[PDB]
Amino acid sequence: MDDATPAEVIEVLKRTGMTGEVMQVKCRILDGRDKGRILTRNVMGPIREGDILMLLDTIREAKEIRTP
Prior knowledge:
Layout: E1 5-13, E2 23-29, E3 38-43, E4 52-55
Antiparallel strand pairs: 1-2, 1-4, 2-3
């Protein structure tokens, strides 16, 4: 229904001024099935601990090996 769970930024990762393009922040699951789940993602804009982010289930891709 909600897909993503409501959470508030707890920790922010900031290293030096401009060194990339997108800023990354740390947030911890405030509620959900996992709860306490902390995930890090790159988000553009001045966002620091205290903000609210959405936790969407990440799908893992399978790596295929190609032989000659």
